[PDB]
Amino acid sequence: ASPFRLASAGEISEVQGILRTAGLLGPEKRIAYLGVLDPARGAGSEAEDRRFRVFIHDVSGARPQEVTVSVTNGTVISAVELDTAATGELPVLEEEFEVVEQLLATDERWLKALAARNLDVSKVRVAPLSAGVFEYAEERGRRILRGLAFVQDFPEDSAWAHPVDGLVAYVDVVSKEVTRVIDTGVFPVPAEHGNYTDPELTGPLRTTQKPISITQPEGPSFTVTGGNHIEWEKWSLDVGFDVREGVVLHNIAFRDGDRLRPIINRASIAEMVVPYGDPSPIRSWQNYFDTGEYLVGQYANSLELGCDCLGDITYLSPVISDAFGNPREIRNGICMHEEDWGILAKHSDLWSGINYTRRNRRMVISFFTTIGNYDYGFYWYLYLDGTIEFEAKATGVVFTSAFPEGGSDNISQLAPGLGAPFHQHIFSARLDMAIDGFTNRVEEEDVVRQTMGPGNERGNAFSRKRTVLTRESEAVREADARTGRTWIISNPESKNRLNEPVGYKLHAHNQPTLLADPGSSIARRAAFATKDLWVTRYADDERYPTGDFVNQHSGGAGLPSYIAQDRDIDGQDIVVWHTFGLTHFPRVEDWPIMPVDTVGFKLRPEGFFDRSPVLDVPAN
Amino acid sequence: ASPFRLASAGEISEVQGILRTAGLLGPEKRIAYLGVLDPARGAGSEAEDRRFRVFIHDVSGARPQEVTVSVTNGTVISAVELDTAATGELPVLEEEFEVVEQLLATDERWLKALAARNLDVSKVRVAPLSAGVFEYAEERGRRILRGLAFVQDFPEDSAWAHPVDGLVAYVDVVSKEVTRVIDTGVFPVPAEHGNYTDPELTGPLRTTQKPISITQPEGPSFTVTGGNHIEWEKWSLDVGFDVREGVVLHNIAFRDGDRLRPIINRASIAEMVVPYGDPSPIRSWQNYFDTGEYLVGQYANSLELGCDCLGDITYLSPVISDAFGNPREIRNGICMHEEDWGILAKHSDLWSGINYTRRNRRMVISFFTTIGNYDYGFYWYLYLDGTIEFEAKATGVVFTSAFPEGGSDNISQLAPGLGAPFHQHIFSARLDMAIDGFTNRVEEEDVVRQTMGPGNERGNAFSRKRTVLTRESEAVREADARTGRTWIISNPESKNRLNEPVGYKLHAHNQPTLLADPGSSIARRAAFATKDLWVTRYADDERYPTGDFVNQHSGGAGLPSYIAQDRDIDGQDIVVWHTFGLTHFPRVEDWPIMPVDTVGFKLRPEGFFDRSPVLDVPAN
Ligand SMILES: [Cl-]
Ligand SMILES: [Cl-]
Ligand SMILES: [Cl-]
Ligand SMILES: [Cl-]
Ligand SMILES: [Cu+2]
Ligand SMILES: [Cu+2]
Ligand code: NA
Ligand code: NA
Ligand code: NA
Ligand code: NA
C-alpha cells in the first residue's frame, strides 16, 4: 500500500491500455521511456494516485510525444507533442541497436570503404553510437546515430579486438538514410583476438583458489515489507527502480531512540556521461550519456547467485516496459544483502583495564548494467554508524581504436596496432536532502591554516570555516583537496543536545571533473560535469542535471538553467547534485577485459546524533 | 633458513647475553628498542648473519647507548654512547608510563593544583606525554615527559571523560624532578562518564543482528612456509615485524608465467605523528610520534578469533624484547587471511552473446595497536589483479580537554563542558621500490587540458604528461588532486611486450598535509609531513623520515637532511616516502568511543603486465 512501491506488471499493462485507447499507441509508436512518478510534496495527507511518465517514439517520422497518465484513474493527465530540434530527441531504443549496421550494409560509400579494407560486410559490426551536436546543420531535428565499425571473426569473437579506424558514418534512423560516410584513410585493423574465454589466451586456469563460504544461519538482519521497504539496524528506506536512473533510494531515515529521523528523501545517479579526449574526427564527437541517452536501468543484468551476489541474498525483480508497453521482468536485477565490514570500534584502556571491540557491517543495495562495451555496478551502502555511501564499479571492454604509427598524446596502445582513446566516466549523484526534515542548508567547510603569531605563538593552531550557500547563483562549488574541502548539510531548526544544528558531511573523492575546453559542445551539454557540487531548490520538474531529453540536445539545459532561478536555499527544501568520476587512461592491464575500477562518495553524520549511535551494538 | 624470518625468542635471549657479557646491560640499563636488521645489499651470494640493533637506556643518569650485535657470531659489532642533546633522546619506555603521575603525586605545586580543584590525588591519572622541543632551555639533554591529568572515578571508569584543563606539568624522569608546574587557571572538570560498557549509556543492547558465518572448508588459498613466507595467487612475500614500525612487508613479487617478478623490496609505515592544533599553552606542545616516540609494534594487541579477525585466520606470534632483554611473545599479534572482494571483471557482450563474470579477492596482513587513548589498525592488501594497498583504521577514545565557555576555533565540544582539540594523524609509508628489480625511476604524472584550436577543433582532446624526477633535490612533490596527479615507478631497463617500461602507479587520497605554520617546531621535526611524496636514493642508515631518535630531537633531521645529498634517482635503487593522513575535527559521534575512520593509498600495475593478469582465474 506504500506510494513508493515498485511498479507492477499490472500497472505497466494499464499504462499501455490507457495510451492505446487514447489513440497514442499505434503500430508506428514506440515507448522509449516509461517510469513511475514519485508522490508529490504537500501530500502529508493524500490518497493513492499512481502516475507514470512516458516518452513515445514514432517510426514513421511523426513528432514524438511526452505523456503522463494515472494508472489508478485510467486517465491521460497530459499529452504533448515534442519539437525535437528545440527540446531534444528521445532516448536511444534497444531496437535501434541493430539499425546502423543494417543501413550501412546496403550503402555504396560504406561498402566501398569496407571493400578497400577487404572486410566482409557480414563480419562487420557497427556500434549504434549517440551522435551529440556539432556542425552538421542537416542534423538538427533529425534522429541521428553515428556508426563505428568492429570486425567479428566468428559468432563468438570479441569484435572489440578489431576496430576499423579512419572510418565513420552518420545515419538517420527514421528516414533510413545514410547521411554521411567519412573515410579519413585506412588503418590496419588490429589482428590479435581478445577472447578472454579462449584457453589459448587465458592459458591453464588456476586451481589454487580455495572456496570461501559466506552464510547466514538465522537469515538476514534486514526485513523487507511491501515489496521494497527495508528496515535494517535502525535504518528505514524504500528501494525504487527507474529504467533511466536504475536503483533509486527513497525516504532514508534513521531510528534514533524512539524517533524516526529522516536523512535523505531521494538518492539516485541522475546522469553519467563518457566524454572521449581523442581529437581524431573519427571519434572527437564521442560523448555517451549512458544514463541520459541509453537508459542504464533497462539493461540491468540478472544477477547470478554465488557468482554475482555472494552470501544470503534477497532479490527484487523490477518490472519494466518493452518498446510496446508490455511488462518485462528483470529477474533478480537487484541484490540486497548485509556484509561484515571489519572493526567498528576498539579500545584497550591503560587505566580501566577494559578491552572493547565491536564489529561493523553494511547494508548493500546493488545492481549491475551493460551498455555496449561498458558494464557498471552501482552500489549503495548503509553503515551501522550512520554513514551513507555510494560506489560505482567500472568494468567491461575498453572502447577501442587503431594505435597510430608514431604514437599518440590521446590514445593508449593495449596490443599491437590496437589503441584505447582517453576518456572519463563522470557521474552525477542527485541527493534530495531531508536532514531531520526538509528545512536544510548547505555550508562549504574548509580547513584554515593559521599564521604563527599573537595568540598562536608556537604556530601549531589550525581551524576551519563554514560558508553558508544562500542562493543558487553561489551554490556552484568546486573541490579543494588541498584545504580538505567538504560540504555540510544541516537543519538550522533541529539542534543536538549540545545545541548545534544536526548535520551530515559530504566527503568527495576530489577526482578531476570535465577536462574538455569550456567552449566545447560537451562542456555545454554536460555543464554539471564541470563542477563538483551544485545545490538547487527542490522542484517537481528538475530531475536530471542534463534535462529530460539529452539525445542531440543543443546545450545549456538542465542545471545551468535551473540555478538561473537564483532561488532561496538557506533553510529550504534543497537538492545537492554531486559530480564525481574516473579519468581513464587505458592500460595494458585493461585488455582484453578490464578489472573493476571504482569511484564514489560518502556522507558521515556530523553532530546529527548526541553521541555515537553504535554503543548498543552487542559484543559478538 | 630465510634471512627474512621473524626473530625467535632464542635470538632475543642471545642478544641479551651478548650485551650482558659485554658489560652493557647492568641493573640500571633498559632496552628501549630492539629490532633485527634486514640483510644488506650486495648479498646475492652471502651467508647467514643475523644482526640486531639495540637502544639502551640508563636509569641512573648515564649516557644511553646504541649497539649492534651479531646473534650468529655472538659479537658486539658496534657500541656507541649517544649525546642526547645532539642526536635526540631514546623512545619512551612502557615502564615510564606510570612515572609522571607518581612524581607529581608528591609535588606540592601539583597537589596545590589538585586541591584547588578538589581532586583526590589517588583518583588523578596523568598521561605520560612526549614533550617535544620548545623554549625550555633546561630541557636540552634531559629526558622530559609532560603530564596532563584525567580523573578516574573508580577502577573501571574511563578517565578520558574527565580532563583537567588549565594545568600541565613537566617532569625529568631520570633525576625524578618535577621541573615545571603550570596552572593557567581552573576549568570545571567535565562530569558525565564515558563508560561505553555501562548499560546506562549503551541502553538496551540490540538483538537484531543475525550472525554472519565466513568459512573455508578446504583451508586458505595462501601457504605459509618458514614461519613468515607467504605465497598467494601469484604473489610472494615475507611478513616481518619490528617493535617500532610494526608489520613490515619484505620482497613483494608477482609470479608471472614462469618468472618471479619483484615489485617492492620493503613496505612499512615508517612514522606516524599526531599534531594538535589548539593554541592553549596547556596543549600547544602536543605532537605524538606514535611510531617514532612510542613504538607502535610493542603495543600490538592479541587479536581474538571471531571478534578481531573473522574467517579462516592464520596467526603469526611475533616475539619481542622486554625492557630487560627477555623475549616476550605477542600471541596472535598478526592476522593473515584472504577475503572475497566482489566482482573482479564482468562483461555481457551484445555481439558474441558471451556473458562473463569473475570474483575478486584480497590477501590481508594486519595487526592492531594501542597507544594511550588511540587504537590503530594497519592493513596491507594484495589483490588478484596486481593491486597493492595499505589502509589505516583509526579508533579508540579522542584526546580530551575542557570546552571553553564562549566556544573555540580550535576545539570541538563532545559533551557538556567537554572538548576535543583539533588534530591530525599523519603517516609516512616508506616504499623501498623494486619494479622488476632495483633499477627504478619515478615520474610525476598530471592530466593535461588542451585548448580548443588547431588540431583540437572541437575542444574535446585531453592528455597527460610525465616528469622524471632525476635528483633528490627535485623529488619533493606535493599533491594536485585537481590535475589528477599520480606518481609512476618504473624500470627503464625492463619493457613490456609493447616495448614500454613496466611500471606501477601510486594513487594517493590527496588528504591535507601538515597544517602547522612552517616556522613551527613540529614543521621542522615533522618536515616529511609537509609534503605528499619524497624520493630518496636507497642507503642502509636512512630508515625513518624523522631520523633514529625522535624524542626531544631538535629538528631538520631525517628526510630533509638525506635529500641534501642530492643523489641520482634516475634508474637507481630508490625509495618512495609517501605522506598521508587524517585531519580530525572531532564530532559528537566520536564520543565516548570513536567509530573507525580510515586513510591509505594504493598502487596499481601500469604496463607492468602484457595483458590482464587475471584471465586465468576460474569462473566459480
Ligand atoms: Cl552486491
Ligand atoms: Cl572504458
Ligand atoms: Cl584483518
Ligand atoms: Cl583522536
Ligand atoms: Cu573507461
Ligand atoms: Cu583523531
Ligand atoms: Na535546441
Ligand atoms: Na530536499
Ligand atoms: Na639537537
Ligand atoms: Na629500492
Swiss-Prot record, chains A, B:
Its cofactor is Cu cation; L-topaquinone. The modification 2',4',5'-topaquinone is found at residue 374. It holds the Pfam family Cu_amine_oxid. Substrate binds at residues 288-299, 371-376. Binds 1 copper ion per subunit. Contains 1 topaquinone per subunit. Its EC number is 1.4.3.21. It catalyses: a primary methyl amine + O2 + H2O = an aldehyde + H2O2 + NH4(+); 2-phenylethylamine + O2 + H2O = 2-phenylacetaldehyde + H2O2 + NH4(+). Cu cation binds at residues 423, 425, 584. One of its GO terms (biological process) is amine metabolic process. InterPro entries: AGAO-like_N2 (IPR054157), Cu_Am_Ox_Cu-bd (IPR049947), Cu_Am_ox_TPQ-bd (IPR049948), Cu_amine_oxidase (IPR000269), Cu_amine_oxidase_C (IPR015798), Cu_amine_oxidase_C_sf (IPR036460), Cu_amine_oxidase_N-reg (IPR016182). GO terms for molecular function: copper ion binding; primary methylamine oxidase activity; quinone binding. Induction: By phenethylamine. Topaquinone (TPQ) is generated by copper-dependent autoxidation of a specific tyrosyl residue. Changing residue 374 to F: Loss of activity. Disulfide bonds join 309-335. Keywords: Copper, Disulfide bond, Metal-binding, Oxidoreductase, TPQ. The active site is at residues 290, 374. Catalyzes the oxidative deamination of phenylethylamine to phenylacetaldehyde with the concomitant production of hydrogen peroxide and ammonia. PANTHER family: COPPER AMINE OXIDASE (PTHR10638), COPPER AMINE OXIDASE 1-RELATED (PTHR10638:SF86). Belongs to the copper/topaquinone oxidase family. Homodimer. This is Phenylethylamine oxidase. It comes from Arthrobacter globiformis. The lineage of its organism: Bacteria, Bacillati, Actinomycetota, Actinomycetes, Micrococcales.
